[PDB]
Structures are given as structure tokens and as C-alpha cells.
Nucleic acid binder design. Sequence first.
DNA 1: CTCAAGTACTTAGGCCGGT
DNA 2: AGTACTTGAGC
RNA 3: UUCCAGGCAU
Lengths: 112, 107, 269, 171, 88, 97, 559, 182
Amino acid sequence: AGRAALYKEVYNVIASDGSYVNYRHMALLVDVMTTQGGLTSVTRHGFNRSNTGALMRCSFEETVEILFEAGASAELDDCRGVSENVILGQMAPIGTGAFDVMIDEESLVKYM
Amino acid sequence: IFVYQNNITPSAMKLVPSIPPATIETFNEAALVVNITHHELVPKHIRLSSDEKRELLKRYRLKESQLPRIQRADPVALYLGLKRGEVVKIIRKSETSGRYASYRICM
Amino acid sequence: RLVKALEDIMVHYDNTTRNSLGNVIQFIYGEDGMDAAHIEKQSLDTIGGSDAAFEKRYRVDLLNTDHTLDPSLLESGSEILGDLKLQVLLDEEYKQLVKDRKFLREVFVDGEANWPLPVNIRRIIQNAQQTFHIDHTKPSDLTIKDIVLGVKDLQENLLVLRGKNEIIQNAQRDAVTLFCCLLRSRLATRRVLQEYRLTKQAFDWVLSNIEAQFLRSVVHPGEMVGVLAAQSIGEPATQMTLKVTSGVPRLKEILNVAKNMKTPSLTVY
Amino acid sequence: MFFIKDLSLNITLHPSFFGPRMKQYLKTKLLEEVEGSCTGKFGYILCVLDYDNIDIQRGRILPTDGSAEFNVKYRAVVFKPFKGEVVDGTVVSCSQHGFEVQVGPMKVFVTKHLMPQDLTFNAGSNPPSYQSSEDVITIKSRIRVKIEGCISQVSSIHAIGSIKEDYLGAI
Amino acid sequence: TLKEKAIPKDQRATTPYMTKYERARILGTRALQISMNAPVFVDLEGETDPLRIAMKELAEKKIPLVIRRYLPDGSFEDWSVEELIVDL
Amino acid sequence: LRFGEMERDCMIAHGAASFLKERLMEASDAFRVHICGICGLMTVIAKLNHNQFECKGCDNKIDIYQIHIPYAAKLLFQELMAMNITPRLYTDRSRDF
Amino acid sequence: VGQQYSSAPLRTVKEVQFGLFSPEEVRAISVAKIRFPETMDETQTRAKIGGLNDPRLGSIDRNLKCQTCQEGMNECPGHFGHIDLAKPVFHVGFIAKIKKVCECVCMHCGKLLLDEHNELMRQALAIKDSKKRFAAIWTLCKTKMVCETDVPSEDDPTQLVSRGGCGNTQPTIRKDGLKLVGSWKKDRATGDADEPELRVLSTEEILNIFKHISVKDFTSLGFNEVFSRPEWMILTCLPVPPPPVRPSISFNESQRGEDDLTFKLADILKANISLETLEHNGAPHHAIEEAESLLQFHVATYMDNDIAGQPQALQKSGRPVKSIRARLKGKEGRIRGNLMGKRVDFSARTVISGDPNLELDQVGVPKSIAKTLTYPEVVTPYNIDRLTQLVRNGPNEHPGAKYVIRDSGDRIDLRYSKRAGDIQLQYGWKVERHIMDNDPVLFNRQPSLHKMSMMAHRVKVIPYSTFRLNLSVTSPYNADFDGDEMNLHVPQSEETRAELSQLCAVPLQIVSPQSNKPCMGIVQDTLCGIRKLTLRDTFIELDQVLNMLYWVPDWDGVI
Amino acid sequence: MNVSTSTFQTRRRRLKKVEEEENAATLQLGQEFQLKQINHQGEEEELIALNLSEARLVIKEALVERRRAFKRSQKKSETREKELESIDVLLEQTTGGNNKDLKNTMQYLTNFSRFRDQETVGAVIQLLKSTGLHPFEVAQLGSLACDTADEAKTLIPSLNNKISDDELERILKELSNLETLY
DNA sequence: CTCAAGTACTTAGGCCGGT
DNA sequence: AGTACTTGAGC
RNA sequence: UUCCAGGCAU
Ligand SMILES: [Mg+2]
Ligand SMILES: [Zn+2]
Ligand SMILES: [Zn+2]
Ligand SMILES: [Zn+2]
């Protein structure tokens, strides 16, 4: 019932200007905030605190301070993060990179 | 279960976990005057047997973590007498697809 | 902030919306698995309108001289009158549509019937029209069985979640529902042959189109919905040229989990 | 001694050769980059068994450039000496400091001071030799040594051995 | 710890069609290779551009590629260019 | 010209991963280092000529990897090391999930 | 990139493990003994003293030498050296937690202050989370200030049981400068001690008490036995970043450069030698400590200079001296400004002026840029002929190219190479050529807050110095012409472009998902006109109607 | 790139490369040769010891069967010294050429091989492998000609207590009988 | 042990003189 | 600046 | 380069 009001309200912030946003969008955000368990805030204090890898959260306000607490608590990073790869100069698990492409010799012969 | 009028001894309550298995719930009176669940906003929930649950995982290659959480104190949580690990099924109407399915695990 | 707070959210090959933790954030993107782009405001007729109107439209009684279909509309017309085996299907149709009426009126307390939904049907028939020169004079050639049964099937194929078991399948019905409603609103027997003299051919066409046209309107696992949905909101954010805290400042008040919002109201009915 | 371990190898192929005779070139590549190799980890790679059923699996096209990396699962005959492993081979070279005996693709060396005393060392010997009461060692003379210590290098695992123990020496 | 590889082509879960990213990615990849002077499994009809050839190989579904789809937990399904439809 | 944050975002949205990378590596930093298969550091003493790979200290010389990452990150890491923070780099995961 | 081949098996980073150096690792890894503080200059003699910067580490002056690893500058990344501190110092950033750990453990023994024996503790020893746990753990024993050896076990609170020893009270601690301090007691008006009893907590003291902390206690708190033993939060040996991290901007010859960093280290060092030579010699004892905290300062400010106890270690002239932390700090920092966003090659920017004659998806490009921006194309029998013409066509006549690269990693500079007119292209060779009419490209108008703020357009090289884009694609970029400029990037791989043309072209972006409704459309002149032209009251005779019909490209050619 | 050549067993190399055992015919061979090595089929599998000659047979076998698949798509008996020349050619066909080792491993394996015959070899193994002995021993005891349980359990010290002096003796003698002539 | 300071962290995004 | 967690404090 | 400052995008 909370997500309810959050969405309900935020909607009246974008719909106040008359504009239109397709639910899904707003809903996603309203969700991302709620899911976790309560009312996770979209700020350095809240959201950027979850178990996301350190390399990630590192790129948004806490920066150094974060990496410190990484070597300290000896964290581990998935590199499942958009950001991760970006920093690593690697193709990220995003749309185009959400799968692997391969040569199946089998077909590669029945074609000739 | 229990319906206290204006409170309980801070010394008393510290003996609810005294007789396990069986557990004890403390509830306020004025806090039951109205049923929250009946509220326009709050959608219905449902408990899940270890089966109904383990099936939700096996069928979503999910880990307990990755599962959307609901407080242990969450208003509704107590209503249906929730317990740290139990899973709930939230089912509400959707302006995009009539009815949406969703699960909440307890904190 | 909005962006940095959704980056890693996309739709994974099963249609689950997660992040680097795979933490589910929406089981079916947009609570329907449809790519926003493929949507238009279609009208869910079956919702508003006098309880009367509903009848004059969707009702068909093969057991009546005033409520049966005039054999001018249907070819197998008159030769169906009384056939009680058909008035069963013809009823389940009307019974299902009524369930809808109270369904929609239950999700949409407003009554408001114009909504965002995949596969525009007015035009999918609008083409069906002139593409077959369909003349509003001569009689159709569909069977009460063709119309009714074929629609039941159009549905059996509007797949969103493929899943091979129960749980999954169930979420599939849910992920649709709202659509079929619309579907059944426009593929009602009466409507089908009277409102727009459909032929069998034309019909099978309109059907097959809604089929794929639907399947296209799905959501592509790869979509970076997070970064998306984010911008989509923070975009019309700067385009906001602004007694209750409203708009731009209020939006911040929100995202910040406002411990003490300037305006606080509390509308009690 | 000798073994047959199950190994694997990642060969990156050029899109160039993404033809029909792919498996053909892959296998042929594997062979170039393996038969005759050597690492102190597996030792001397000598021969891939079963040229036929070599596993290639669907290799994956890499990023940036089109090349695809294949993980070939093979098996072959190898030989990795061991400290203490006793082996007898043919003598090769022989100097004032000792004779280097060859056992397989490998060379084990024996020091003057790592064999019996009575076993001299003939200087004016053509070919050079090592004598004793009733023993004459040189070029060919087959020997039997106890591999004392292994020293891995490039793609050649050397070692040192002794014949000053019992049941060791000539044969 | 699952060496239990991935899913069998049977019990195939995902979508029967190709994702815009997949075609996008395939056409590119295959192009890149045709331009790498890779072999061409079609009948160039003068087509001198690679992304053109790939554009075509893709229409005669004669691209020898495999789309390894990944599921949120690591397991996966293998789909062949042939298989996947193309309503993209 | 700069292909800063705002711009990254757009591409991420688009789902144009290949391109994003290209403008981040080949069109900018992009650099090649060597790692110790063990201590995920750039220690490695690559004499890319005689091949000698040592890295010693951790004393490897046999299990070593080449990796392409933006020189900015090479720096970023060395910079974190200078503050006594170890950014280990592993060519494979063990964690799973 | 970073050139030259290496048999080095190649891979991508999958995991990233954050730890903390062990004063020995810093040694194992190190190649530099680093004793002298001076830059180098073999005493005036330009070179480098085997002391600071290159006493083996990387090098300066385009010179192979660099621990033979050679490879000269570009290739040989940094080579870390070390420099054995004088006395243990706090790690400026960890300090907070070093305090918070003491507040959690008793000195003397180095064991917990709350065994599962105190139930409330268990609750915490279960919070699976090496952080939220260490959160519960702290708040819990940051109260108990007497390392007990006798507590009422699980059994009757009338049957107490023992555990560790030494009950030596624990002084409530508090922060100050770069050193901690606590106050003990022992009665008050009873017998001696009474009021507080203030003592300083020497680095050595704390570190040692930490080293003794249990192996399963490391674990119990928020640590890890292999990568972060609290006993490390304190610096013993100092890892020395090599040249590339602190480059020396050498102005010509016999002229300075040395990085702001290189200075801060030369400082730390001096302040170290000062200390040790006060010990191994005339040690006026607690007159030394006064020169110790000086090292505690540097080695602290070297990492961070923007603290509470202000003294911004002003690098004489008043400059503050950019601490490492500052190098990474948000935006501009290696992170936000160098990795999440970079400057790139193959990019162009000019003033945009709309055109009613380009297809929606085209983009007018100045012949200037068409000769500046290239694109590596592979020599293939397909183009070979064309490609050769371009090459020999020169890098100045529009349709042409400027660079030909043979496999043998050597670029032929078409604009000089006394063989430019020659050159026999070789299949598999690359020929960086001029952006040609119809090359997908990324065009965008910051600030980019839309998905459609960047789109792919067809290059249509035209004259004059402006980016002349179609009109309807005006409102999606948020573009007007009163002096507005736009950026445009050039793909580089056969697949990169693929990604552009198959997902980024304007024709696609036509219907925005943010509002399930198109985001372009007819505007201004055409909009204003489309109406007038419509109206019943508007007719047109043959002469004109014919010209109109013609202007429409497709027209079935049938009036 | 050229990923050297990995084995079939993954050991979580977590920073501490410290330990690396010492080699010794004390049956202590690097992990890469434990009694328990993982057959690529994932299935466990006792180590694989080849004894001179028995090895020479392996090589020559696939080394010739290789000559076949080297001509299958080209359209699309002992004598000690004589064999040394026979294999010499088989090499100049299906081998690598610069594989200087393999050639030498054959010549060494052909001169010193003990039983130059497939049956005779299997026979040996039916006998040997039925001792509970580590394949390494099963190997050594096969490729190394011994007389006394002394010459035996002296050069093959891993034994000593494993099999009695008389038993190993019985067997040792079995080999001299079965010891293919020449 | 529950209340008012104590105590610290970003503020949009690109491009173009003095010392 | 503003504004949000956290520290310190007389009860 | 570095550090401050100023200016422009209706
Ligand atoms: Mg303007
Ligand atoms: Zn190392
Ligand atoms: Zn070097
Ligand atoms: Zn103690």
C-alpha cells in the first residue's frame, strides 16, 4: 500500500505538468525503491548501499571512502555490473552483450 | 495471540520466546479498531507452504536473497502471522495486465 | 541519481527484471512483458455503458425471434434458431464477457476505458475491411463455432512467458488477461458479424495478425529498462517549467524519502 | 614412469579459416602447439593419442575481432622424471666432470663425485671414458641411474643422478 | 559449483524468436568475419559490402552461429541461427 | 570531444554494448598489462621478448595473463595500491551464483 | 593496444578481490629499496639516483632500461617499490575503524569482549554480513569495559563459568588528530586512581594488540584471514607508486617536473630518516615522538589532505597538494571523469543548421571533417579495387584516405611516405579511409538525457562548415540553431557500426517507449504550411501540381 | 592467446601459493599425478602408468592409426634394429618432424623396451596389476629388469613393506619367463 | 537511557585569460 | 547551503 | 600541464 502511494504520488508529479509516462517506467523505479524491504531512498545514503559490487557503488558519491571499506571488509565483485565492465574496458552484459556467439562446426560444413 | 489495552510491562513481554515451539503475538487494541487489509490500497497476500515456496524457487532459479522482501513488522506481516523465512504471494490489479503476481519473503 | 540507481536493471532471458544480484525487481517487465513502443490507447468497450447497451450489443439468443441473429448477417443464420447446443457456447461467450464487465470495473474503479495496450485492433480490422472489399450488404459465412472457438485459440497463443510448468504458466494468464478482455470485447460474435460484416477469410486474417502483431509487441530480453525507465522520468524532469508542494521540488521531496514533506495534506473520505 | 594425462588447450582461430576444413586445421594446430612441448608441470608432451576423437566443442567468437577461441580436450603420452625414480638409458657425452646419460627425451647427468671412487676417468681415451676394476664406461655403454634431482628449464627438464648406490651403474 | 553445464535443447525455455540485439549482434559479428576474409556461405550477388552479405547469409539462414543465451543464474540455452525465427 | 557520463547512459539504454566499449577502449585508453595468476596485481615483470615472465615475490613465472583494460583503470588500481588497497584481478570466478 | 605481441594467454576480468597489503607483500613485490629522498641526479649528473623514483622502478627519458623489462615508456606500466616506515602509522582512511576495533576488543590479550556466552552477542554473530554484523558487534561491546574471565554461563546464573583471562579494564576511547586516546578509572573516592587516567595509544601498542586478535575473531568482526587482517589497517612498510602514477613533466632539458605526489613522498621519507636517526642515536626520548607524529602526518596526508584537523599540508606557495584520494573523488576523478566517461578519438563538433532537403536519418557533414575523420577498412577482394583508388587517390581529394597499415604493425603515412603513389594493397591489410557518404555515425546533442539524444545518421558529406541535419530530428536532440553545436562520433568496427545501424538509426527511434508515442514529427515551416495547403479553400493548377508531383521521390509517375 | 595447456583439475589458488610439495619416488608426485586424477569425462580414474615398451606400443599404435586419418581425407613382426628404421619412417609421416623428442623417445623406447609384443604386455599387466601397488610401481616393476627382492625393493623403495620379499620374488621371476626374447 | 547538537557530503554538462 | 545520518549528554 | 578567474549555450 506504500508502493501504492509512492507511485500514486510520483505520478502526480509528472502528470502535474500534463505529461505522460508509461506506467512501467515509473512503476519500475517505485518498485526498485520498495522491493528491498521498505523505502530505500534514491540517494548516496540509501540505494547506493545495497550489496552491489564495490567497484559499482564506488562511481557515485562515496567513491574513495567506499573502496576503502572494500579492502577492509575484503569484498568481492561480480563484475555483473554495467559500470564494472565500463571501468574494466570490457563488453558489458547489456543487450548486445547478453549472450555469447559461437561457430558450430556442424552447420559450418553442411553449408557448402 | 493477545489484545493489550494500553500496553504491557517491558519486563513482561521479555518472556514471549520463553515457551517454544508455540509462539506469542502481542497486539494493541486501538490498532485493531480498523482492518488495514480492507484498505483501498493494500492488496491481498497469501502464505506459502515449504512446498508452495521451494516451488517458487525451483521455478525461478532464485536464491532466498534475490527475493523481494517484506518486513517482519510490516503491518500485513503480523496480520497473517508471518515468520522469518515464510513467503507471501501479493496479487493485485494492474493497469497493464489485469492481475499481477508477486512474491515477498519475510525479514 | 535516477540513472546510477537502475543502470544494471534489464529483462533477462526468462522475462524477469533483475540487476547484478539477479535480485528480482519485477517478475514480468511492466507487469506485462510488453515493450512500451508497441502500444496505443485502445478502448475497452466491455466496461462503460448502460447495462442495457451491453445487451443490445453482445447478446445473442438463438432461442428468440427478437434476440437471435438476423439470417441476413449470418449465412447459416435461420438454420441455427433454437439449436440449444449453440446457445450454450453463445452463452459462455456472453457469460465470459459479463465476468469481464465486473472485472474491468474492479481494476478500473474510475470506469475510464481508454488505456495503453499492445496490438491495435481497430486498425487490424480496419485493414481487414478494404483488404477484402467486405460488403456490408451480403451475408457473412462464419459459424457461431468459428467465431467463438477461434477466439478462444487466438488466446492460447498470445505467449509472454514460455515456461513448461504450472507456476510459470499461471503467471502467463495473469500477464495477459487485460489484453484478451480487450480481445473478447472486439471479437464478440454479434460485434464480429453485425458491426463489421467479417467473412471467414477476413476473420482468420484478423486473427493471425493479432497473433504475431502481439508476439512482436513483447519485450526483448536485452533491453536495459533501468537506464531507460530512468531517463524516461528524469527527461520530462528538466522540461518542467514550474497550495501543495508540487512538481520539480516535490519530486525531489519524494526520491529523498522526505522525512518531513512541506505539504502533508491527508484526504479522508 | 611414463603417463597419459587428460589435458585441454585454448586455441584461438582466425575467422579466416572459418571454413569446412576447420576441425582439420584446429587439430593440426593443437599438434603443433603440443607434441614436443614441455613444462615442469606436466613434463614432456610426447604424443597425442587418438588423433581421431579430439573434442573441440563449440568455440566462441571473441569480441572486437572475429576470432573464435576453442577449448580442445585431448589426452596424450607424457613423461615427467622424479627425484629418486630409477631409470636406465644410453650414455651420451662424457667429460672430466662426468658423463651425461640420456633416458628418453631427457638427459640425466652424473658427476665424478656421485659415482664410486674406484671408478676413475680416462683422459687419453678415444672416445673419452671412465674406468674401474672391471668396468669401462663411454659413449654407447648402457647405464642405469637413480634420478637425484630435477631442474626444469625452457622445454627441457634436466636432472642429476647417481650410480654410487647398489644395483646401479652399468648393465 | 555446477559443472552441470546448461539446459538441453529439449526443455528449451526462452523465446522462439531472435532479439533485436541478437540479429544486430549476429549481423555485425558475421560481417566483421566476412570482412576478415572469412568464408561466405551464400551466393554474393555482387554484394561487396560484408554487413550486406551477412544481411543476406541471415536471410538464407546460412550463418553458422550459436546464440548462447544466459539465464540469471549461470545456466543457459543454446540456439542456432537457423532455429530462431526473424520477426525482428 | 568527450563521451562523458550522460552519453554512456544513452548507449547503455540503447543496448549497444560493443560500441560503448569501442569508444571506451580503442577510441580512448585501452592498454595491455600482465597479471599474476595468484596475487591479482600487475606486478608481473613481462620481458615480452625473451618471454621471461617471473613476477617473483609471489614467484610465478608460469601462470600469467594478458588483459586489456583502460590505462585509466591500470592507474586507478596502482593508485589504490599506493594507498594500500589491493584490487585483485582474477581471470575466472569461483563465487558462482 | 600497449602494442607488441606477448604469448601471454589473454582473458577478461571476472572477479575483483579487494584486500589490504601485508607489509611483507609490499616487500616481496618491491624492486626499489628507496632510501634517498632526493629525486635523483647523480648529484647534478642527470640520471637517477638509486634512491627515489627509478632506483629500478619504471623510468623517464624515452629509455629502454627499466629493469631490462625495457619496452620503453609505453608498455612497461609502473614498477612498485617500497620504503620501510620508521614506526607503525595509522592508515588515514582506516583510522576510524582502528578505533572501532579497539572499542570492540580488550588489549593485553586481544580477544572479544562478548562471547556467545552473552546471548545478545549471538544474535549478532548470526547477522550474515561482514558489515551489518560488525555493526551489531560494535554497538554491543562498546559498552562493556572490563575483559571478564568469569560470567554466568548458559547454566543457572548462580553457576558462573570462565573463559579468557585478564580483566584489565578497557578505557573509553575517542578520536584526536592522528592518534587515539582513552581514559581508565578504578574507584572514585575509594582508593587511588579515582578520576580519569588519560594515556596515549601508540601505534605500536594498538597494532600489536590487533595482531593478537583471534584468527576467528578477525572473521567474527568484519574481516578476512587472507586479505584483510585488522593488523594491517596499520602501515609498516610503504608501497611506492612508480613514475606513471606520479609523472615528471620534464620541461625540455636540465629543467624540473617531478609530480606533486613525488614531492609528498620525498617528504614522508625525510620525516622518516629524521625519526630513525633520533633513535639509533642521541634519543632525547619523548622529544622524538614529537617528530614521529610528523611522519604520521605525511604518510596520512599523502593519501588524504582534506580532513578535520585542518592543516592542509600546504605545498609551499600555499597550494594544498592533491592527496591521492582527491585524484579519485567524484567527477574529474579517475572514476567519474576518466572511466565512466572519457574523451575519445574519431569525434567531431561544429554548429548545426537545419536543412529541409536531407532524409530524416541523414546528417550533412562538412568536407573538412570528411577528410579528418577516418575509418579502418580491411583490404578485401571486394573493395581492393576501390580501396586502392582511394589510397593512391590521396588524403586530400575528398573521396580518398590517409593511412595504410600492413599486418606488420607499421603505419604508412599516406601524406608523406615517398611511396604514397605506389603501394600495392594486400588483402588483410587495413586502409584508414575518409568517412564516406553513407557511413553510420553517432550524432548527439548534449546534454544527453534521452535514449534518443544520440542516434545514427547516414553520412552525406556536403560543403560548408555545418552539421546540417534533417528537421524532424530537431525536437528529439532538443536542438535549435541560435549557435548550437553538436557532437558526432565515428564507429570503428564492422560490428560496432552494425550496432549503430541496427539499433541507433533515427528511423528506429521514431516511436519513444517513454511515452508509447512518436517523438519526432512535422514542425514549423512544414507544419505551418501543411495546414494552409490542406483547406478546402485551397486549389492548385496543373503547372504547379506537376512540379509538386515530381518533387516527391517515389511518385508512381502517374498524375 | 596461447593458454599454455591446462589440466583437468581446478584448485582454488587463493593467494597462498605457499606449500608446493616436494617431488620424490616416495610416491609423492605433484597433484598433477595423484592416484586420483579426474578423467576428462569427469569420472574419477586411477593414475595411468606406462612402462617402457608398453608405452612404445601406445605411441606406435595411435601414431600409425594417425597415418590413416591422414589419408582418409586425402581422397576427399619384431626385429629390434629393423623396427628402429620402420618407426623412423612412420614418424616422417604423421609426426611433427622438429619433434626431436618423440623420435628419441621411440628409439630409446625401442631399444630398451622389454616386451615387444601386445599380448606379452597385457599378460605382464594381468600379472602385475593385481598387486594393489601404485601404478607407478606397477610401471617400474615392469620396465625395470630385476633379480633379487633386493635389486627390486631397493630401486623401487616405495615397495619395501607393500609386498613380501618372496612374493615380489615369485613375480619378479615371472617377468623373466614372460620377458619376450629378442 | 532518550534528547539536541555533533559531523560530514554533494551542488548538471559540454566548450572557450592571469601565473 | 541543506540536510542527513551520528555523536555526544545531562538525566 | 597546474592552479584560480571569467565567459558562452535564446
Ligand atoms: Mg540555442
Ligand atoms: Zn604475483
Ligand atoms: Zn619495466
Ligand atoms: Zn583481555
